Fold this sequence. Notes:
By secondary structure, the protein is of the alpha+beta class. The protein contains 21 helices and 37 strands.
Amino acid sequence: FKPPPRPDFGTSGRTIKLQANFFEMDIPKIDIYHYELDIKPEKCPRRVNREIVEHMVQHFKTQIFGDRKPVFDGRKNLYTAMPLPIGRDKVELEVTLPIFKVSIKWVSCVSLQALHDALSGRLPSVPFETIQALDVVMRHLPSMRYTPVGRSFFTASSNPLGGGREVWFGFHQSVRPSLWKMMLNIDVSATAFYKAQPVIEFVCEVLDFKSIEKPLTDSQRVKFTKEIKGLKVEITHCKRKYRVCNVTRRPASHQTFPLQQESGQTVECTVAQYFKDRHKLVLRYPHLPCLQVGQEQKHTYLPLEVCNIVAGQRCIKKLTDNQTSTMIRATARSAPDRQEEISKLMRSASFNTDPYVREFGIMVKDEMTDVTGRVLQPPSILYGGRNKAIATPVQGVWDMRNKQFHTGIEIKVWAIACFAPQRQCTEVHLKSFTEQLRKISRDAGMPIQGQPCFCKYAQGADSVEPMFRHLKNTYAGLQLVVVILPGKTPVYAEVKRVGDTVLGMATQCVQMKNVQRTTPQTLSNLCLKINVKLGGVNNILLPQGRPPVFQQPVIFLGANVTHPPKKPSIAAVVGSMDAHPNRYCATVRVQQHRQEIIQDLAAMVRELLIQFYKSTRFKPTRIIFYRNGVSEGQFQQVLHHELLAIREACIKLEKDYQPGITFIVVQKRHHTRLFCTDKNERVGKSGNIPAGTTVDTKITHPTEFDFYLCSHAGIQGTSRPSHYHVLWDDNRFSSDELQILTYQLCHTYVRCTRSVSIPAPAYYAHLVAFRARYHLVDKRDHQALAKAVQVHQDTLRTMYFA
RNA sequence: UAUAGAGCAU
């Protein structure tokens, strides 16, 4: 269960000069002394812990600390570059700030030399405790100077998004090990916050009011409840922060709570009356509801006009479609621009003048690390038809002009369901849309032979299922049902649910805007999905020139767990069903809320292996498992439970079936940025690195098998190079063969003629989980939730998720 | 239609 070492360094590809947002750290050889803080009371905010620790350092600078500048991680860990005048014995002391008891005890020394030795690769594993200590040193001053959020820092600059939310600009910071060097990783980040403002103004923005002008309808009140629930408020009629648990149904003039009088008897008092008697405040908006704060037992109700949303709360609830576009537009930066913003950050951070960094004798190089990348050459894409045409990706893109599908599918009986009113979508429109899909159809090797046999408009999600039940029975061999949607509507969720999991009909929805104004590229892309949904093969990797792994039966898997913002989490595993590889079967499960480990993985892998054996007649000798987005924190847990589950599936099939397992974690959510050193290598308006750029040196793991591969062309903003970490490899891949293999798999994604940012199986796993969300639509029996996700027997064999 | 892109613990 220990990750394998790096087997070698790749040599394939054209060398390219690069810079990464990794800055070398010169670490002294000293020992760090580690002290544990016990602060009473506990579970104060990390900030107050810092202020408590802050004042303590000056008082006992005379007695305890002196001229040393200790660093504090909040919570309970304090570090010094110099041992404190404290015997191993504990010291209990008192800190008062506008009363806290604090006990200091030595815990350990951190040997920076041991880190030096582990970076040489000599030690088997880098000491995690030394890396933690360095991280606390580097972010001590930023933590005091800004509002920390995860490993990022933010501050006050308006960048509105509407609905009460703002986008804040900050930066990410983390210390990371590489070969022979510790690195500081710095990046610009931007996240959504709630604007600090009176709650009265919050309801306006959440409910679109011009101004506060009576009562809330059930509609308005339940919407405002979702927006504010969980957010923290501060009191103004007295500075006192509460958490909003709920928004009362009754208005402040009629909401009551039990109040104990001078005598022992308790009475019901309205919130409005109480604020008249106890605070001499006549509520200005008595018709608006209250906020229920604190424990349910106390009946703590706060009128809206007395609370502010507390400044600094990071928005985690999902953003509306418009807010998302405004944040994306406002945060996208071209690769060259991002490099400059990082350079500015390093200048203003001025780490080499941070007194805490200098206290510990640390220096940070101000230039980005130079790394040589290798641009891998892309695969050739083999198409079908009489030409047998071979596309060659250029800058991560190709097209399908003068080429047709490898295995095109005759569409002899299909038809159109229009859910947009015919004033919007007219009969002339449908045929004006159908006539051009025909041309792009037959051109592309998938010929829609004739007209749409049935063409009936309608509205209503209840209309969805009956219409479909009508069509499957009456039209023999009805292959495809095209559906037309008028903007966002729950009909979409019902169309997939019915077709995917009920009747088992190939479904293809098209926005109403795209039928009226037709693009050949949009039509062509529309055929990519249609053909696959009907069982076709759009194209295959050029058989020759595939990596040697294809000499023996191999199955490729992609695993993914998507979580809700308690709603259940969704696990998805897809598996290749041929040697191309192009066709994938899907398995999906619902599991506990927010659990990263795929609980039912063993049964899912077993199902996929059986399907592979039925489709090919071969038992895979090798299992290549692409696992999406598990942080390093959970490598050991995820690997332990999921690597054993994979083996369990093979042994459960056949006592002595033991194919080689390669376990690879795939990570887009990191802060590694790569920039071309030479301007001639920039691709596009965004100026990113070329598709195929691979880095496995200089900024990678000191001993383990990991590499960055930017398989895609950067279109908007700065590219995210995908990171791949081999946690297990029975098959002893060379660095070259695994990188090339991973790159070629990024060219087998059927939705577009472009190399995508992750391999098709990992991308399909994301789609299969994503589609299961719409399957779960309602209008919570866990046996019934597993039922709403299980797909029809007709569809499951085919890639319905495309 | 789709890739990419900011983020996604009283």
